[PDB]
Amino acid sequence: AALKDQLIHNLLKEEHVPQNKITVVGVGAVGMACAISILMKDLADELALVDVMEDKLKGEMMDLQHGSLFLRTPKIVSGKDYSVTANSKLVIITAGARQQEGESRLNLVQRNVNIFKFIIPNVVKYSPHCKLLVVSNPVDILTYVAWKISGFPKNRVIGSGCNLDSARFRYLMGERLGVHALSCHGWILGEHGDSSVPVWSGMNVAGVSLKTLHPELGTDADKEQWKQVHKQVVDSAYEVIKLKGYTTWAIGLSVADLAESIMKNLRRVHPISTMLKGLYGIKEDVFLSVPCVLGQNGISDVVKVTLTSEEEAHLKKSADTLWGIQKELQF
Amino acid sequence: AALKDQLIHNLLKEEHVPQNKITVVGVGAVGMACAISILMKDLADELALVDVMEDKLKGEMMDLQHGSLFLRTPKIVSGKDYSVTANSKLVIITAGARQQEGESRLNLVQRNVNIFKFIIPNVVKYSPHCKLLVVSNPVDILTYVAWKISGFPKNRVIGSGCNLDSARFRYLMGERLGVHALSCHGWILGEHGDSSVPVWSGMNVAGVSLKTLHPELGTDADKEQWKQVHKQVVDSAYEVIKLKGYTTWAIGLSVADLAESIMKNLRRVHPISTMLKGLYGIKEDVFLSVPCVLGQNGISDVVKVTLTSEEEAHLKKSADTLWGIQKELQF
Amino acid sequence: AALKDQLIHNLLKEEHVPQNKITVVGVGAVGMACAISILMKDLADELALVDVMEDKLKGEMMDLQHGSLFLRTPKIVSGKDYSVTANSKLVIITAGARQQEGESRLNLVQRNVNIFKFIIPNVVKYSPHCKLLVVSNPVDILTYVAWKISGFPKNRVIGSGCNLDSARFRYLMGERLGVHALSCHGWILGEHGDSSVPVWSGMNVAGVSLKTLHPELGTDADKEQWKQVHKQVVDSAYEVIKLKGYTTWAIGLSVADLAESIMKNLRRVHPISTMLKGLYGIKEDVFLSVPCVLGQNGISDVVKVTLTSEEEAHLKKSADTLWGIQKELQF
Amino acid sequence: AALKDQLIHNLLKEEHVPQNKITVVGVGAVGMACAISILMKDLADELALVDVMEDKLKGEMMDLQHGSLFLRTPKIVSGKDYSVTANSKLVIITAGARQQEGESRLNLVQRNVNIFKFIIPNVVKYSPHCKLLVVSNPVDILTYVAWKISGFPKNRVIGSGCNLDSARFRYLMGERLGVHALSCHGWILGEHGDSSVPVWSGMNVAGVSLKTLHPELGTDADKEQWKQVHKQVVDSAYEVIKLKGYTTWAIGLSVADLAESIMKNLRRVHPISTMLKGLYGIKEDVFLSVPCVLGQNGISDVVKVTLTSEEEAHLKKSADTLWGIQKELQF
Ligand SMILES: Nc1ncnc2c1ncn2[C@@H]1O[C@H](COP(=O)(O)O)[C@@H](O)[C@H]1O
């Protein structure tokens, strides 16, 4: 017969069900950065890519497949049709609406809701037990949208939130102190972007609190302008976009880190976006970044960080704003 | 009174001299794919990026730096000035001229020569003991150019050649046979691109020669059209460019694989482009892909593959053509 | 309340089931080598250790747990009771009886049967869907025993067979040729130990068959004594025992390699022990090493290697001997 | 002539000089655990093993070599003669004298000095630029001995100190809180063993100080007995020795972690043993564990942890005792 039949003797015709499947939605720069980072960390036995642009999609898939020899992820698949995403343990959403000049913020968000209205039900249909990881911006709001539309319990809908911002923060701390980011500890919480909260009290190296050694840390009396470091974190995003057009690599790595905690059930603590109703006097259905314990069931626990009245107020303000927008959305 | 001084007691203001530095020249899609793949394989303690576009360069560097928390490569640097590349063990060249519409092959190469005339001397100036790995196309010719201009001994100038083409080939074999690419063996040699030579005799799984089981393999009498698989490997590159605009990920992975053999002195055999004068009756200064042993000093040995008179002639033809062009170049 | 309650806010109550659990039976040197190799390759989210010696068991567990900071396997457990092995995807058996002076082959095997009669039913009880990987010697026979007692279908009972022997063989060929073992290809098949079959025809580097370049390869006319290399592979085990008392590291690495193919569904080809009834004119229920495709469902396919009449006869001889013993066993 | 010559065409006869060589001294359980951990983390391109027991040494080497296919460290060597250790970047010392019953502390140390008087000069002779990492106990004293005998500057002589003790501590914290050890932070400082200092003030999760939430933490008024966790860390070593006879795995992993920081120049902070004269009012030449920044030149910086008068006194006491012994030693 065929060569295959002359060479290989088959013992078992069984249809495969993947054990550790991950799906990435959106094959723009961010999606592809997430994909490659995941592939290089051996987190999945099957990777699925979905987008609306069929050509780009197929091309990215082929490019990855050609590298199979150098990978340990035996199956990479793609398609416009969400059936290819079946049985994902984790689905990462990077797709969004592309911005129009002169469009209001509310309008942009609504257009994303309309996109998610197509995406989410299709995801849930084929992977009813998956965890959702939302990366698209604005992340805290779109994580809420995905939660609402999916009908999943809140532990299973996760926003990337301030994971990357905290990583940037630690990198910058490390630059100033001459130590690796891994050994600098610091937390950025709340709303992703301009209104994030740097928790000065918690900043340390080897368990030595910086605020104790330098009490003006994070104030304006601060002659070393540490307050600037936080501003720098917020600005660096735009700085990079101004320079190369967009951001990709850092987000990809940050997302893969989250995926690792989930796929391996590590129960590490990450500053990620979860529903916060009932904490710090927040009474609305909003998602904000707090330190969360992350594992195979998504977010199981939250760490209660002790905040100053100023910081606590800053969070409530963010919650009010987010709710203000969310209440205006048409589902 | 400064915080750093209150926290850290310094023992040494030592000079950074990096031990395992890698430089990537060119921060287009291919360059950046090489960079990220290298970063994720912990091959270097310092990575340098060089290009002519300062904005793009700086942006890519920052994006990578922001991910330092998730990496184990403590120093990432960039610049227009080649001084930032000093003391590289390995320098990867991805820069080049893009071909223009209806442009003659000789003309295209000459334009690249002019670019390399600036790049190579600067590289050699700051890293006189490095190995050069050329990725730019056309790779066999440009590897020759780099060799000529660098004045390095031939063991230290390496072209990526048919490394990726062979990897694509094995992937496709694996698809047809239902086994991983890792367990399919096959070699594509000679000139990179449409005139590559698939060595049918050497194709095997578990040491079982396919040509023995299916004697018409690779001919036109072949009713399974295995000859098509080779055509497919050649077409793949264009197929992907047509679909997504360019090729990146697979090259990045293939290059990182080569970097691994070099940085860790593995002495694995790869189908890569080396100077072949003196083999298969080739008497000209030409580079073509043959199976090479790759280690810390570059290419130390070559494996003498037994070729049919047809295959051998095909190689000589390629050598003649390449020399025909090379002899016309203005250095 | 407690500190834990003041610090952590719980969102989700539930007792969890591990997704990628591996169990190792036997915590002698071989078992522990398998364990450490598996832990360092991030193959499992939970690792279970079982043995009869409760002290040694608990001590090994604790020692490993203390290293959890440096690992990515969050749960390590142990116990005399097999309930701790529940929900394993893969169970690796290293326990067994050591042969006595003057003791017949049949007697040795029977003593192991008696041990397996306790182990296997307990394993299958708590992990009815697992794959069994038998490492204990004599491996081909004990793999049969485990199959018989488990009542599992044959694709799911795997013997480590000649995986390590082939790896040793490639290492030795690499030493002689000056290339890495990864680039030397060679297969040792059949019965593990002194009756193994080195398949000379299939030995190659870069697809160049050594038998073609050196037709006396593997004969006694062979002035380079390649036949000795195979003898060396057989003797290696004893050589190492004579020197350091026992063997561990290489087996551990070889087993982890198999585990990787299974846990990641790679469908790589390994020379491992599977039931061969129906191949090479073998009509009995025996296990021998042949090249097998290994994936998430165990052994799905076998590669039909073309053997010389001598080689084929050698296999049949081994099958006859094994059956001779197996038919006498008391279950 | 030979098959090798018919198959491989040599282009380069060069001398091998390893780029990232590591030597382990002592092939007892601890040494071998360090070796395997290092091999599995791809930290070296050459690994050397040295001990006085030639048989055990050779056997361990061979066992490792047989696994070469599954490793990416191409050269593993061993010998009684220290010439095999030439050009090591890092030398790890695990050899030492085993205690005799009723032998005084001073006597035991002196016997180790006599051993180190043979080892260290030989190490320094062949690898004059290496860093020394001392693991043997008592580590703080023997690190001093090695420093004295080597004549190296102090940044290059490192004791493993409380690295593992801190790792155990974090594991136990994690067990109590239901979070991974990676996300629990805590430091054990000073003299390795019974007199270590747990720094309660610095203990945190996500930057939330436990001492702030539970002010009696670490006292006897502490109804949760956190003080016990420290006792547990000290006892666990003996507990494991009672159970298995010795400790191996955790030390091996801890050491490999340090090796990673050194070989990759990460500048992470570890609690390791360095010379402390001039800090906390210590005026003698003694080594104790404090948080050190670790990189390619060894210890570049030390973090000044803020200590209570009790803690500070505890350290001075330890310094006095160590000096008491050190001043009696015959070099
Ligand atoms: N616009 C296009 N972009 C990319 N590939 C194309 C295009 N048009 C045709 N091709 C295909 O690319 C292949 C040519 O080989 P190569 O240039 O080596 O990729 C043929 O199979 C063509 O059909």
GROMACS .gro file of C-alpha atoms in nm, chain D residues 17-328:
model
  312
 1010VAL     CA    1   3.902   2.579   2.655
 1011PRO     CA    2   3.575   2.564   2.846
 1012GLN     CA    3   3.378   2.886   2.875
 1013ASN     CA    4   3.148   2.808   3.166
 1014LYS     CA    5   3.308   2.534   3.367
 1015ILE     CA    6   3.193   2.428   3.710
 1016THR     CA    7   3.375   2.194   3.945
 1017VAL     CA    8   3.220   1.999   4.229
 1018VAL     CA    9   3.454   1.876   4.501
 1019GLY     CA   10   3.320   1.571   4.682
 1020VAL     CA   11   3.093   1.305   4.531
 1021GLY     CA   12   2.901   1.210   4.841
 1022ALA     CA   13   2.524   1.247   4.837
 1023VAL     CA   14   2.545   1.626   4.865
 1024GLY     CA   15   2.804   1.663   4.591
 1025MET     CA   16   2.607   1.444   4.353
 1026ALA     CA   17   2.285   1.634   4.428
 1027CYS     CA   18   2.464   1.957   4.341
 1028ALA     CA   19   2.597   1.794   4.023
 1029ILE     CA   20   2.265   1.665   3.896
 1030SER     CA   21   2.084   1.991   3.976
 1031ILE     CA   22   2.349   2.187   3.787
 1032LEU     CA   23   2.338   1.952   3.488
 1033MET     CA   24   1.961   1.984   3.465
 1034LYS     CA   25   1.975   2.364   3.466
 1035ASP     CA   26   2.225   2.392   3.177
 1036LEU     CA   27   2.459   2.610   3.382
 1037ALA     CA   28   2.786   2.468   3.255
 1038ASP     CA   29   2.950   2.358   2.930
 1039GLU     CA   30   3.189   2.140   3.127
 1040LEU     CA   31   3.144   1.978   3.467
 1041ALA     CA   32   3.431   1.836   3.670
 1042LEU     CA   33   3.407   1.603   3.966
 1043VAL     CA   34   3.692   1.551   4.211
 1044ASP     CA   35   3.725   1.328   4.517
 1045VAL     CA   36   3.976   1.091   4.679
 1046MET     CA   37   3.774   0.772   4.621
 1047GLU     CA   38   3.870   0.690   4.261
 1048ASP     CA   39   3.621   0.408   4.209
 1049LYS     CA   40   3.314   0.590   4.334
 1050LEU     CA   41   3.429   0.893   4.135
 1051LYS     CA   42   3.468   0.712   3.806
 1052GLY     CA   43   3.137   0.530   3.855
 1053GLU     CA   44   2.941   0.848   3.916
 1054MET     CA   45   3.104   1.007   3.613
 1055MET     CA   46   3.013   0.716   3.385
 1056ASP     CA   47   2.656   0.702   3.511
 1057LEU     CA   48   2.615   1.072   3.427
 1058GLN     CA   49   2.785   1.036   3.088
 1059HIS     CA   50   2.543   0.763   2.988
 1060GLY     CA   51   2.267   1.022   3.015
 1061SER     CA   52   2.442   1.266   2.776
 1062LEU     CA   53   2.165   1.229   2.519
 1063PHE     CA   54   1.926   1.389   2.767
 1064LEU     CA   55   2.159   1.670   2.871
 1065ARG     CA   56   2.310   1.980   2.712
 1066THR     CA   57   2.637   1.974   2.898
 1067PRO     CA   58   2.874   1.813   2.650
 1068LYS     CA   59   3.169   1.737   2.879
 1069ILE     CA   60   3.173   1.564   3.211
 1070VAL     CA   61   3.510   1.477   3.361
 1071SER     CA   62   3.653   1.349   3.686
 1072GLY     CA   63   3.976   1.255   3.858
 1073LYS     CA   64   4.178   1.245   4.178
 1074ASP     CA   65   4.418   1.498   4.030
 1075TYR     CA   66   4.306   1.863   4.041
 1076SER     CA   67   4.440   1.936   3.692
 1077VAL     CA   68   4.096   1.819   3.570
 1078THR     CA   69   3.946   2.124   3.746
 1079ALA     CA   70   4.142   2.377   3.542
 1080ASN     CA   71   3.963   2.696   3.431
 1081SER     CA   72   3.657   2.659   3.648
 1082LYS     CA   73   3.452   2.976   3.686
 1083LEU     CA   74   3.296   2.828   3.997
 1084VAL     CA   75   3.415   2.563   4.237
 1085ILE     CA   76   3.174   2.407   4.483
 1086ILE     CA   77   3.320   2.243   4.791
 1087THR     CA   78   3.119   1.966   4.957
 1088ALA     CA   79   3.403   1.757   5.098
 1089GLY     CA   80   3.469   1.751   5.471
 1090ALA     CA   81   3.547   1.540   5.775
 1091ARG     CA   82   3.272   1.333   5.935
 1092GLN     CA   83   3.230   1.392   6.308
 1093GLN     CA   84   3.350   1.152   6.576
 1094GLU     CA   85   3.153   1.083   6.892
 1095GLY     CA   86   3.303   1.272   7.186
 1096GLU     CA   87   3.523   1.482   6.961
 1097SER     CA   88   3.533   1.850   7.054
 1098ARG     CA   89   3.406   2.115   6.813
 1099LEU     CA   90   3.753   2.265   6.782
 1100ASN     CA   91   3.901   1.927   6.700
 1101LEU     CA   92   3.646   1.859   6.427
 1102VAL     CA   93   3.709   2.195   6.262
 1103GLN     CA   94   4.086   2.142   6.277
 1104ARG     CA   95   4.052   1.810   6.097
 1105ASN     CA   96   3.862   1.994   5.823
 1106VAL     CA   97   4.128   2.262   5.810
 1107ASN     CA   98   4.378   1.986   5.740
 1108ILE     CA   99   4.164   1.861   5.455
 1109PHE     CA  100   4.113   2.212   5.316
 1110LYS     CA  101   4.489   2.268   5.334
 1111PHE     CA  102   4.515   2.006   5.060
 1112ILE     CA  103   4.205   2.098   4.858
 1113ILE     CA  104   4.211   2.477   4.839
 1114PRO     CA  105   4.568   2.534   4.720
 1115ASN     CA  106   4.509   2.280   4.444
 1116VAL     CA  107   4.187   2.448   4.340
 1117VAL     CA  108   4.345   2.795   4.330
 1118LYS     CA  109   4.644   2.661   4.140
 1119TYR     CA  110   4.436   2.548   3.844
 1120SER     CA  111   4.154   2.804   3.855
 1121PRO     CA  112   4.309   3.124   3.993
 1122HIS     CA  113   4.008   3.338   3.893
 1123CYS     CA  114   3.729   3.114   4.019
 1124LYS     CA  115   3.473   3.183   4.285
 1125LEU     CA  116   3.461   2.945   4.577
 1126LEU     CA  117   3.129   2.827   4.710
 1127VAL     CA  118   3.163   2.637   5.036
 1128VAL     CA  119   2.883   2.400   5.138
 1129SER     CA  120   3.059   2.178   5.394
 1130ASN     CA  121   2.972   2.217   5.762
 1131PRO     CA  122   3.018   2.403   5.973
 1132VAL     CA  123   2.977   2.637   5.679
 1133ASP     CA  124   3.041   2.977   5.836
 1134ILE     CA  125   3.372   2.860   5.984
 1135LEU     CA  126   3.489   2.660   5.683
 1136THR     CA  127   3.413   2.952   5.454
 1137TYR     CA  128   3.652   3.153   5.672
 1138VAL     CA  129   3.911   2.875   5.646
 1139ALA     CA  130   3.885   2.865   5.266
 1140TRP     CA  131   3.917   3.242   5.249
 1141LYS     CA  132   4.226   3.240   5.469
 1142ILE     CA  133   4.398   2.960   5.278
 1143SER     CA  134   4.302   3.077   4.929
 1144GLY     CA  135   4.418   3.434   4.976
 1145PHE     CA  136   4.126   3.536   4.754
 1146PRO     CA  137   3.952   3.867   4.819
 1147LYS     CA  138   3.632   3.818   5.021
 1148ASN     CA  139   3.384   3.889   4.738
 1149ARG     CA  140   3.497   3.561   4.581
 1150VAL     CA  141   3.465   3.326   4.876
 1151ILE     CA  142   3.104   3.242   4.950
 1152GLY     CA  143   2.938   3.015   5.204
 1153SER     CA  144   2.596   2.863   5.131
 1154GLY     CA  145   2.499   2.977   5.482
 1155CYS     CA  146   2.127   3.022   5.544
 1156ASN     CA  147   2.010   2.999   5.181
 1157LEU     CA  148   1.843   2.662   5.236
 1158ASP     CA  149   1.719   2.744   5.585
 1159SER     CA  150   1.535   3.046   5.442
 1160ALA     CA  151   1.392   2.826   5.166
 1161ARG     CA  152   1.262   2.578   5.423
 1162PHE     CA  153   1.120   2.865   5.619
 1163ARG     CA  154   0.927   2.997   5.321
 1164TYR     CA  155   0.794   2.652   5.240
 1165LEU     CA  156   0.657   2.618   5.593
 1166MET     CA  157   0.508   2.968   5.584
 1167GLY     CA  158   0.341   2.874   5.257
 1168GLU     CA  159   0.194   2.557   5.406
 1169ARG     CA  160   0.037   2.759   5.685
 1170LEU     CA  161  -0.103   3.032   5.457
 1171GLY     CA  162  -0.202   2.823   5.154
 1172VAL     CA  163   0.026   3.015   4.918
 1173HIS     CA  164   0.334   2.906   4.722
 1174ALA     CA  165   0.673   2.948   4.888
 1175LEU     CA  166   0.766   3.188   4.605
 1176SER     CA  167   0.510   3.439   4.729
 1177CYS     CA  168   0.598   3.410   5.098
 1178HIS     CA  169   0.891   3.625   5.203
 1179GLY     CA  170   1.109   3.578   5.506
 1180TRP     CA  171   1.474   3.582   5.601
 1181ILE     CA  172   1.685   3.365   5.826
 1182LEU     CA  173   2.020   3.527   5.901
 1183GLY     CA  174   2.339   3.483   6.096
 1184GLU     CA  175   2.496   3.156   6.197
 1185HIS     CA  176   2.375   2.851   6.008
 1186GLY     CA  177   2.201   2.595   6.234
 1187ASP     CA  178   2.062   2.627   6.588
 1188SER     CA  179   2.158   2.992   6.640
 1189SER     CA  180   2.005   3.135   6.321
 1190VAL     CA  181   1.803   3.453   6.350
 1191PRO     CA  182   1.452   3.465   6.205
 1192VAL     CA  183   1.383   3.826   6.112
 1193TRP     CA  184   1.014   3.853   6.204
 1194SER     CA  185   0.982   4.219   6.107
 1195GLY     CA  186   1.061   4.138   5.742
 1196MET     CA  187   0.807   3.861   5.694
 1197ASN     CA  188   0.541   3.943   5.438
 1198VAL     CA  189   0.304   3.832   5.166
 1199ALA     CA  190   0.241   4.083   4.886
 1200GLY     CA  191   0.424   4.341   5.096
 1201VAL     CA  192   0.185   4.306   5.391
 1202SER     CA  193   0.388   4.272   5.710
 1203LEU     CA  194   0.270   3.981   5.925
 1204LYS     CA  195   0.415   4.141   6.240
 1205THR     CA  196   0.179   4.436   6.185
 1206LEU     CA  197  -0.128   4.213   6.161
 1207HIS     CA  198  -0.019   3.989   6.449
 1208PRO     CA  199   0.205   4.189   6.683
 1209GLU     CA  200   0.287   3.889   6.907
 1210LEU     CA  201   0.440   3.708   6.605
 1211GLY     CA  202   0.766   3.541   6.706
 1212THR     CA  203   0.716   3.591   7.080
 1213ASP     CA  204   0.594   3.338   7.339
 1214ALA     CA  205   0.268   3.532   7.391
 1215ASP     CA  206   0.211   3.418   7.030
 1216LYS     CA  207  -0.090   3.187   7.046
 1217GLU     CA  208  -0.016   3.063   6.692
 1218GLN     CA  209   0.340   2.961   6.788
 1219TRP     CA  210   0.516   3.103   6.484
 1220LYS     CA  211   0.834   3.079   6.684
 1221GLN     CA  212   0.788   2.702   6.637
 1222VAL     CA  213   0.823   2.731   6.261
 1223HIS     CA  214   1.181   2.851   6.304
 1224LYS     CA  215   1.252   2.566   6.546
 1225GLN     CA  216   1.103   2.335   6.284
 1226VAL     CA  217   1.346   2.466   6.021
 1227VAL     CA  218   1.641   2.387   6.249
 1228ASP     CA  219   1.505   2.044   6.344
 1229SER     CA  220   1.405   1.939   5.990
 1230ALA     CA  221   1.765   1.875   5.895
 1231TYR     CA  222   1.807   1.621   6.178
 1232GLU     CA  223   1.457   1.484   6.120
 1233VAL     CA  224   1.554   1.398   5.759
 1234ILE     CA  225   1.891   1.248   5.861
 1235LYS     CA  226   1.711   1.031   6.118
 1236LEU     CA  227   1.471   0.916   5.846
 1237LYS     CA  228   1.689   0.860   5.538
 1238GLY     CA  229   2.040   0.887   5.686
 1239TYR     CA  230   2.138   1.218   5.523
 1240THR     CA  231   2.013   1.523   5.335
 1241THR     CA  232   2.068   1.575   4.964
 1242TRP     CA  233   1.801   1.707   4.734
 1243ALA     CA  234   1.715   2.038   4.893
 1244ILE     CA  235   2.079   2.139   4.935
 1245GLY     CA  236   2.148   2.048   4.572
 1246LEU     CA  237   1.864   2.268   4.454
 1247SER     CA  238   1.963   2.554   4.684
 1248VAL     CA  239   2.321   2.539   4.557
 1249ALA     CA  240   2.215   2.529   4.193
 1250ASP     CA  241   2.007   2.840   4.260
 1251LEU     CA  242   2.317   3.021   4.382
 1252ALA     CA  243   2.514   2.891   4.084
 1253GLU     CA  244   2.251   3.034   3.854
 1254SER     CA  245   2.289   3.384   3.999
 1255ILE     CA  246   2.666   3.360   3.959
 1256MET     CA  247   2.687   3.206   3.613
 1257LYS     CA  248   2.420   3.437   3.469
 1258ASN     CA  249   2.522   3.747   3.665
 1259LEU     CA  250   2.168   3.805   3.785
 1260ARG     CA  251   2.244   4.018   4.092
 1261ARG     CA  252   1.970   3.853   4.295
 1262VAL     CA  253   1.975   3.879   4.673
 1263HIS     CA  254   2.043   3.562   4.871
 1264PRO     CA  255   2.096   3.498   5.242
 1265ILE     CA  256   2.449   3.366   5.221
 1266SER     CA  257   2.760   3.364   5.434
 1267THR     CA  258   3.005   3.650   5.379
 1268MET     CA  259   3.263   3.826   5.593
 1269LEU     CA  260   3.084   4.073   5.814
 1270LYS     CA  261   3.357   4.269   5.990
 1271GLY     CA  262   3.240   4.627   6.020
 1272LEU     CA  263   2.866   4.561   6.036
 1273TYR     CA  264   2.643   4.548   6.342
 1274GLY     CA  265   2.943   4.635   6.561
 1275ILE     CA  266   3.124   4.313   6.475
 1276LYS     CA  267   3.499   4.371   6.479
 1277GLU     CA  268   3.634   4.024   6.410
 1278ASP     CA  269   3.707   3.831   6.089
 1279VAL     CA  270   3.390   3.618   6.084
 1280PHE     CA  271   3.146   3.498   5.820
 1281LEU     CA  272   2.770   3.506   5.877
 1282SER     CA  273   2.467   3.500   5.651
 1283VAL     CA  274   2.322   3.833   5.547
 1284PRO     CA  275   2.136   3.928   5.230
 1285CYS     CA  276   2.398   3.955   4.957
 1286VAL     CA  277   2.379   4.061   4.594
 1287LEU     CA  278   2.526   3.775   4.395
 1288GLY     CA  279   2.664   3.795   4.042
 1289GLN     CA  280   2.953   3.697   3.816
 1290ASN     CA  281   3.212   3.845   4.055
 1291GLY     CA  282   3.061   3.688   4.363
 1292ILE     CA  283   2.931   3.920   4.630
 1293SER     CA  284   2.925   4.281   4.514
 1294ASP     CA  285   2.693   4.431   4.772
 1295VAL     CA  286   2.531   4.355   5.107
 1296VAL     CA  287   2.187   4.469   5.223
 1297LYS     CA  288   2.187   4.639   5.563
 1298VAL     CA  289   1.892   4.484   5.736
 1299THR     CA  290   1.753   4.684   6.025
 1300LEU     CA  291   1.771   4.465   6.338
 1301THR     CA  292   1.630   4.489   6.689
 1302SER     CA  293   1.881   4.520   6.973
 1303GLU     CA  294   1.793   4.159   7.065
 1304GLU     CA  295   1.864   4.034   6.715
 1305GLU     CA  296   2.184   4.241   6.695
 1306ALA     CA  297   2.304   4.098   7.027
 1307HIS     CA  298   2.228   3.746   6.906
 1308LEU     CA  299   2.460   3.804   6.608
 1309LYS     CA  300   2.744   3.944   6.818
 1310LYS     CA  301   2.718   3.640   7.042
 1311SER     CA  302   2.757   3.412   6.738
 1312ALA     CA  303   3.053   3.618   6.613
 1313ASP     CA  304   3.227   3.588   6.950
 1314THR     CA  305   3.185   3.210   6.953
 1315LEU     CA  306   3.308   3.166   6.597
 1316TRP     CA  307   3.610   3.386   6.656
 1317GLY     CA  308   3.680   3.196   6.979
 1318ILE     CA  309   3.730   2.885   6.771
 1319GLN     CA  310   3.892   3.044   6.466
 1320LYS     CA  311   4.166   3.207   6.674
 1321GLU     CA  312   4.269   2.859   6.793
   0.00000   0.00000   0.00000
